[PDB]
Structure 1
Amino acid sequence: SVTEFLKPRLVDIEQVSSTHAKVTLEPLERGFGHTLGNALRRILLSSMPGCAVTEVEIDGVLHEYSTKEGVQEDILEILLNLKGLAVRVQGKDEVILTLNKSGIGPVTAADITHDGDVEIVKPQHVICHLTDENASISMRIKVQRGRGYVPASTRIHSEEDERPIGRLLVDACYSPVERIAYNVEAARVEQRTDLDKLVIEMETNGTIDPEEAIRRAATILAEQLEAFVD
């Protein structure tokens, strides 16, 4: 008829690591693979909700370009390390966590104050390298639940909320999606290779499984147009 279409039944999933997915779906209708891949990539990149760090408050440091004698790493290195940190808050949308370290300084994510609501996927993820023995670091990070990627440049405007000093703004990176890509190849079924085969490469920060992220993105996209399908 004119409604049977075609569906990808040779679904294959390969897991290089716990945060590495290589999915292959074939056979697909001619050109449909491109639409599906682009829509999924856009939804994952700019529409996947997630909890991530927003801003920091360093004790004894006022500006981003300042220097700290205790830690061999500069302030922007600490900001990058905090941005790379992933958290899985579920009790509340926004929460403050406090870090306090002293002595030897191989400070990783495991030294953060562990609250019941917040969970840290990678406690062994390094944060800073305090070399001086008599050096103490005190940090207060803010983690909020948002969507997509929110750069600090956009949040620079409307400084009234950031009027108190010492509040260094870092990139949000709410979405737990990184290095998402699609490839389209040809597939042969009953002598017609115009059929497309879609290969999806996905990496995640570790908060959720990549297959779970794909499922959530597909569910969100399908539920977005539920009014039209009715």
Structure 2
Amino acid sequence: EFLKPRLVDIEQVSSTHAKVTLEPLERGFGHTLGNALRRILLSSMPGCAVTEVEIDGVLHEYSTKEGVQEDILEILLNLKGLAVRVQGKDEVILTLNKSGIGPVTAADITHDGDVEIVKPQHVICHLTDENASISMRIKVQRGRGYVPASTRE
């Protein structure tokens, strides 16, 4: 007759992180379920990160585009850090078009009927001329863990 854990309170103290609460537990099961669920949550959870980028006038990722003060490699890192939710698909292709002096934020992506950006203030790059525009296609898919480029165009 062990007491069973039931979720009691989900304190969404900020937009990113929360504090779920399990109660009651017999003595010993606290550290067991704690370490176990910590190791499962860090190990393998379904995320929604990005895989392929195709900037329009760019051949290889080591080039430079006329009119943007970051390299194409830095644009790839800033798109690698993109926090995006998908709802009813395996993979999805997002489209970006932006023209004019100033930043290209993450809210300038033409959103589909199910893709949802969760942090729209995310900077990608900075356009820096009156007629100098980027126009890219982004490929965002589901997955699990860390799948680098060397294993898998």
User: By the TM > 0.5 criterion, same fold?
Assistant: yes
The TM-score, its normalising length taken from structure 1, stands at 0.56
CA displacement at 1:133 relative to structure 2: 2.2
Choose the corresponding residue for 1:41, options 21, 38, 41: 38
- Contact persistence 1:96–1:140 (CA under 8 A): yes
Corresponding residue SS for 2:13: strand
CA displacement at 1:8 relative to structure 2: 6.0
CA displacement at 1:120 relative to structure 2: 1.8
CA displacement at 1:14 relative to structure 2: 3.9
Corresponding residue SS for 1:40: helix
**Partners of 1:6 and 1:77 in 2: how far apart?**
52
- Contact persistence 2:8–2:23 (CA under 8 A): yes
**Partners of 1:87 and 1:10 in 2: how far apart?**
27
Distance 1:23 1:91, change over 3 A: closer
Corresponding residue SS for 2:64: coil
Greater Rg over alpha carbons, structure: 1
CA displacement at 1:74 relative to structure 2: 2.2
- Contact persistence 1:58–1:138 (CA under 8 A): yes
Q: Which moved more, 1:132-141 or 1:32-41?
A: 32-41
**Partners of 2:44 and 2:64 in 1: how far apart?**
36
CA displacement at 1:19 relative to structure 2: 1.4
Corresponding residue SS for 1:92: coil
The TM-score, its normalising length taken from structure 2, stands at 0.80
Distance 1:113 1:54, change over 3 A: same
| Per-residue Cα deviation, 1:34-80 (whole angstroms, up to 9, x for no partner) | 33223222322232223221111122223333223321122232122
Q: Which structure features the higher share of helix residues?
A: 1
Distance 1:60 1:11, change over 3 A: same
- Contact persistence 1:10–1:27 (CA under 8 A): no
Distance 1:105 1:46, change over 3 A: same
- Contact persistence 2:7–2:20 (CA under 8 A): no
* Structure 1 stretches lacking a partner, 5+ long: 155-229
CA displacement at 1:146 relative to structure 2: 1.6
The size of the alignment, in residue pairs, is: 152
Distance 1:117 1:22, change over 3 A: closer
CA displacement at 1:17 relative to structure 2: 0.8
